[PDB]
Amino acid sequence: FDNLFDAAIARADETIRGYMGTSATITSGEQSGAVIRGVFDDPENISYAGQGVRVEGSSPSLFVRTDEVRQLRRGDTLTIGEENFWVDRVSPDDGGSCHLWLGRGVPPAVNRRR
Amino acid sequence: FDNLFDAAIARADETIRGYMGTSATITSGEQSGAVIRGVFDDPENISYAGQGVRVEGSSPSLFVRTDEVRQLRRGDTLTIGEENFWVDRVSPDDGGSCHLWLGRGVPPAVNRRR
Amino acid sequence: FDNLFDAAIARADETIRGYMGTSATITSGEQSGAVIRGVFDDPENISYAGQGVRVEGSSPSLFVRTDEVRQLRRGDTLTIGEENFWVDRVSPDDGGSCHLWLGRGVPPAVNRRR
Amino acid sequence: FDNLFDAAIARADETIRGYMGTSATITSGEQSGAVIRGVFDDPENISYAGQGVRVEGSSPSLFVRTDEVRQLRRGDTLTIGEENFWVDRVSPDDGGSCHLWLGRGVPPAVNRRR
Amino acid sequence: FDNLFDAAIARADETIRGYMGTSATITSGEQSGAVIRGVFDDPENISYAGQGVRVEGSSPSLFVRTDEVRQLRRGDTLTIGEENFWVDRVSPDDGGSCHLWLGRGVPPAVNRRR
Amino acid sequence: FDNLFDAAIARADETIRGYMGTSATITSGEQSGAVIRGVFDDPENISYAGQGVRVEGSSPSLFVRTDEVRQLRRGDTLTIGEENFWVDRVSPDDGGSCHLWLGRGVPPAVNRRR
Amino acid sequence: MKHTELRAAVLDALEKHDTGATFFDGRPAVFDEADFPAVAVYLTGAEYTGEELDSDTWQAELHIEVFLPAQVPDSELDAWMESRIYPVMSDIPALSDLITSMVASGYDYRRDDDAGLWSSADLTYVITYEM
Amino acid sequence: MKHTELRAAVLDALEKHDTGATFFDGRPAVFDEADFPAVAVYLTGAEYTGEELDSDTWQAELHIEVFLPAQVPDSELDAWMESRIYPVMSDIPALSDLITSMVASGYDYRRDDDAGLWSSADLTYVITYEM
Amino acid sequence: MKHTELRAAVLDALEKHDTGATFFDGRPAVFDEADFPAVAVYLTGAEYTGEELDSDTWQAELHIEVFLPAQVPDSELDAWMESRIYPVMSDIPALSDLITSMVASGYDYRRDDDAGLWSSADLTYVITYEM
Amino acid sequence: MKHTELRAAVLDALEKHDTGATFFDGRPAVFDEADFPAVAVYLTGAEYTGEELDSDTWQAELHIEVFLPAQVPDSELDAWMESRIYPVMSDIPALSDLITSMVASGYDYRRDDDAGLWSSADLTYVITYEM
Amino acid sequence: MKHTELRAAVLDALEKHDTGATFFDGRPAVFDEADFPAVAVYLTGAEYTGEELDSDTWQAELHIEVFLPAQVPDSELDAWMESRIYPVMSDIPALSDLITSMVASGYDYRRDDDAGLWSSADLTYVITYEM
Amino acid sequence: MKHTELRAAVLDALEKHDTGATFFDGRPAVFDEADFPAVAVYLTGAEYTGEELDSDTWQAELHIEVFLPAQVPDSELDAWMESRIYPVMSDIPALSDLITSMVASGYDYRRDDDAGLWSSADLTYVITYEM
To answer: Closest Cα to residue B24, out of B70, B59, B74, B76?
Structure first.
């Protein structure tokens, strides 16, 4: 590691993930069968669509080490416990770990014409 | 439990509910006769509807364990002490416990055409 | 009481009212001759009605136990020290005590046609 | 005093005014020649009048016991050190002391037709 | 000094200026050749003027004792280290010291027609 | 140094850079072959351009001593680790160190007509 | 003419039909969840039309607003406006003396999403009288 | 006539074709990710036309709004709007009894960027009936 | 002409009737809950009409506005405008010398909900004079 | 007609020329810095024209919008709009079957200053077709 | 012609009468409590008229704005505006050389309630000149 | 035709006169206090005129904006806008080839009060060309 601080924070993040981690398995993607640990967070948000239409839901996310997620790409599908999630956006590398913003549906159809 | 922290927080929430929680009974719904403990919070709010209109009310809530509320669904009626409440929105599973946003009226008529 | 915490907080509020309380007498209303203690707070606000109009005043309130204010209703008149006040809004039951939002004028004329 | 707290706060306020006090003398008003102590504060504020105009000034205030300014009224003139001030607004009775919002000019002409 | 606090804060301010202050010399004005100490702070700010027009600059300031800048006026010129600054606005007397808001350009031409 | 505090803060910043620093090499510019240490921070930001268009990226920056960055100018190219960056804006001198706001692209074409 | 008379004349004939709802006369109206079906009548936006040379003429807008708890289905609100309030408001013998002309204007719905405490819907009229 | 039967008729004629969607009658409609393809029908902005001397005429706008998950492709909404809603809406035998005139108006797409939980698209109609 | 004279004339003709209210001349008016009714008179929005070739003509709006505490019923404000402010302003001998034409405009109500300390109601006039 | 076909035709006729840029179909377009040249095609604001008695007519606006990084010189953006996009869109054989009339409208630039991550430029067209 | 000599002429003709107030030439004017009256003069909103074929014509608005302390009585601002500024601005021999047409426009009052440090009132003119 | 050509043609003849100012071509322009008097030229709001049957016509607005430090006197900006820019911009021999019609529009001043770092003043033209 470049500095003392980088190694220290790597060990600290590893301990955090060990003590507060949930096992998640990727299903469809380049890492077809990897198993990854992370901290699972499911906060709440509600937005209104008009006069009365209220849409109630949640925005889950996952906190994983960036070394085992290098091959991961947007649109992949992974499972935690019983329910299934897909990867929405992968946060930039902070320290030694990065977030996996997730969605609870099936992946959307793609628009790109490549 | 997946982690040490999950078990620790489950025990902590159980102690919180034991030391600061009242008793509520469901009346109409899938859990017809269950009795559940929870922490009752009744903050107040007022919203105006014009120049000289002021609607005074409050938005109560209940804090319950998520395992014994699995069969609960929106629109059910439950009582605390003397007054009667219905269930508005059931918050996502946070840690080991979830909130029951309540209303003080009679349940409203349904719109769905199933 | 339902819990240990309710009794503890009731005693705490009683000590607060004992050590920082002002005696108030209700005059007109269902509780025609009660004498009530509470904490008196008189903060100030100013609002403008135009370019060169400033209306300067204060919005007082009273912190009282909810058991002896059960029969009190909006529009009643009570006095503290020398000045005279009337009840504007009675806050919902919080713990063991509720607020009495007051106004310094004579009561307004009623609009209801009952 | 009504409570222990009222007397305690009165003594604390008297100590504050003794240790951080400036002598001010009223000149024109019902209290024609009183001498009063208080804490003098002169913060800054600047406001813009359009594209480039920038009026720079300050909003002084004084912190006085409420029993000496009972006869004081808006528009009176008082002096602190060398410069002269007039009374703009007298804050309501908080605890045992009130504020004297001041202005640095001569008093304005009156509008009322009494 | 009127109070104990004024003397104490004056001594504390003098210590602050001694331990963290640079030296600035006035050049043109009523105090043509005075040398004054103060604390030099140079924060940044950027403001835009439309699509992409970004103006990068900073708003420097100085912190001096109010007794040695009595004759100072707006439009004066003073130097710190190597660069040259002019006085923009002289803050009101706070406690025992006042700020000197500075600009880094040549003084602007005056508009007054006296 | 002018004061005790300037020397103290210079040593503090030097220790900070030593313990949490990454080596960066300038490539194109007046300092063609310098090697520079600094602290690297890469936070995220997402902005939307319309109904669904979402642009996700990061805005990196580098914390560097100001004495060895005197000759560096906007538009120069420097590399950290493997990726390549260019200087966008150089923060004003704060204490003894300044920031280097970077961008991850190839430098843009110039507009000036000198 | 005297707005008090007009509001009283509307409310008297609006009360005879059994509705079991609290009626507020004038703009200031304060209530809570208990006495909730509440109908308030007020006049707003008076103006000097100056239509005729013979005598003064004014225009004012008459409002009948009903408040219902939030999340009530739209069907209930439709009913108050189209079954209870429209037939009574068409013909009032008392108004015939005071009002030279009374023209309907459309009603509209609004709900509170800030806190979800109330949902109201006001029927609007245009009143032309003499002052 | 009464708004209730009009929405009932349109929902009846809209349900017969298989869509597998939850239909909401009236303005209030609360749901979550489960029943996402919901379709809501409501009337808004009623007004007094004052067109014919014989009897009353009113104008109101009829809305049919469908909700789809955020980040669903645009082309999917196109199909839901045109292929499903437009053909059924042109001719409905039950409507012609109540509605004197029904005119189309353009549909529009709205997405949510504050939280990214929904994306809807509502077809608007203009209705002229008699009350 | 000189706005001082016009406001002085209006206030003189308005004070003779007993009202027991503090009267404020000009826009700057500061008060508290004691001296409450606080009728204030001011002129606003002067403008160059350019109506006649012979001499200058201007247009300005005359305001009479009364302040009353919040939550005071609507009907009581109605009274001030209908039974006190309006009858006096119809015929005032002093105005006829200065003002060539005075035309009424509708009074309007407003209440304060930010803090609930005041509720005013102004009566607007249009003045055409010579300067 | 079906918006899918029209966007498909435009993208087909626009891809043949070498541009080396990612092309997005419809409103949802999510991309990071790596795929920066990005061209998105979508339709917005359809309405019922009601121009001809024989059959239906609609009006919708066609959008072609390109994204380029912030601080790119304005000159470079000028080039995409005036050398790449304009010549190809003038004559496209596939469109002439579906569209009755196509009319140009002015392109316009916009830059992002809140974060400085993107700078787009869209070219607007007006489409009149049959549904 | 050039704006500089126009403002110079107005200020010269405005200074001769004793007023005892500072005068600011041009838009930037920074002052404190001591220099309270202020009396700034500036030009704004220039436009190309294109009224005559022979030569260039322009329109611009000439502002004369005076600053007085907050809570100063309204009547004082009136007296100031009319009595001092209007008579001098009507006829000025120096202006007639440069300005082809000068038209008045109404003055207006504005006060500061954010901080209560200033209250101003500007007289607006419309200038038609040749550049 | 090509906006690059038009901006280059303006700047070439705007540079020959000695001004000692940094000139920015195109919208993106970044600077600081050192290189301050800076003149930027850009084209905005292009639009399809559709004026003539024979060939295409477009309208674009030509901008010449000059930035000067805040609190600079107004009279100085007048000089920059009239004396230096307006005479040179009247007749550009190289311009007449590309532009069919060039019409002046008024300039205007704006200052920055958020932070006081810049004060700009832009001259606006209307350009009609062929594309």
So the answer is: B76
